[PDB]
Design a protein that fits this description.
- The protein is largely without helices or strands.
- About 0% of the residues lie in helices and about 0% in strands.
């Protein structure tokens, strides 16, 4: 979802 893992990263 809102990931730290860099390419599902919408960055919360």
């Amino acid at each position: 979802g809102c990931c730290s893992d860099k390419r599902c990263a919408w960055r919360c």
